[PDB]
Design a protein around this ligand. Sequence first.
Ligand SMILES: CC[C@@H](O[C@H](C)CO)c1ccc(-c2ccccc2F)cc1NCCO
Ligand SMILES: CC[C@@H](O[C@H](C)CO)c1ccc(-c2ccccc2F)cc1NCCO
Lengths: 208, 197
Amino acid sequence: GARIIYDRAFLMACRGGGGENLYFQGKHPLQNRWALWFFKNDKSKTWQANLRLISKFDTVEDFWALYNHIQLSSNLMPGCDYSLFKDGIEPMWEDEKNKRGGRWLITLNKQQRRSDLNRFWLETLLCLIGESFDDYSDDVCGAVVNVRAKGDKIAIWTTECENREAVTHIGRVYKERLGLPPKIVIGYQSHADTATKSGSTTKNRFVV
Amino acid sequence: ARIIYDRAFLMACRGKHPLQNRWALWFFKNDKSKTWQANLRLISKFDTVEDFWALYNHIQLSSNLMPGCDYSLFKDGIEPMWEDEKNKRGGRWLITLNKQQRRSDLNRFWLETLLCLIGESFDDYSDDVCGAVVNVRAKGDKIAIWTTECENREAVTHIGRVYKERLGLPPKIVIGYQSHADTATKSGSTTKNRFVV
Ligand SMILES: CC[C@@H](O[C@H](C)CO)c1ccc(-c2ccccc2F)cc1NCCO
Ligand SMILES: CC[C@@H](O[C@H](C)CO)c1ccc(-c2ccccc2F)cc1NCCO
């Protein structure tokens, strides 16, 4: 009665349609159901009005259908954010599953939009849907991409910043899967520190 | 697979269970010194049974009934205005309540409407549902389910028959479906009903 885990190679092989899905039993179930959110930035609107749920999915094939659809139907607008979160967790730090939590953060420079945004974001998505952090995948809430003019942010959000073992294992595996050099250190920030603006930086509770 | 909750399951969850859709609760007062942008205020969004009940229990305790007001629950991304792309070709099953039935049936009928929406009570035809509107008025209240396409007769009349069943209305009491394009034009004391159940 075990966790459903997909490595990167298996998820890539399941890409590009193909499956007949006979008996509604030929699709590959995910451990969790996931919801894709969009948060727009315009028209003098409340935080709630700008957050929109796009779509939910709980198979590898339906992930790839949505991915292929967004990849062909959507263009990149700064001010926007996309978030993939487990079903029942809103992509806001005030949520019961995020308020005690935080994020592993990747910051991309202006150059790296064109070179690394799509690659790093896909690798992040596969880490989530594939349950890549072993038992510590349960600490994962979701992932956020902030598209910005200064430079783009990609983050894995986790549920509890005081779970050092879980947080640091997520961190180490994520950095490995992004193929980041050991010189490039990524930082974990409590959402409670990120919420308070106190200077040019937020404190990192952990680094890998 | 579609997430469907019957009435009994949703009531059992009242003091997390995902909804098929995310829903947005809107409030609208008729005020001309402010116009349709400032009058229409978003109150809150939700996509679980428990968060529906938290908001319901909150509004039920914290809010008192003012005529001229309207509340609307619509799917996330559909504004509660007929000009919206998802409503302009559509219409509404309308329940009109007399002055007496404000005290007896408003809260009951409105709750039953809400459960039909969040529970996906119309089978595949729940996708034709946009939302629901309650207009609190002195003449007598209005409750309506809004659907996306008035030319989908099969979708529309299934919704109306299930809705009428869930309101526990007698078969003598016939409800009417009105195109938003007919309701927009004031032509007398009544609007034409494209269908009736
Ligand atoms: C920031 C990348 C953004 O780019 C779009 C093409 C618009 O610029 C984007 C957003 C969401 C998803 C997404 C799809 C399926 C499941 C979860 C998801 F988050 C994928 C992408 N991009 C893929 C590569 O283009
Ligand atoms: C019956 C109209 C109004 O009644 C109050 C007395 C108004 O001050 C009302 C409005 C919205 C909601 C509502 C709550 C949660 C989600 C969607 C909703 F539309 C519930 C109610 N009434 C509850 C039962 O009386």
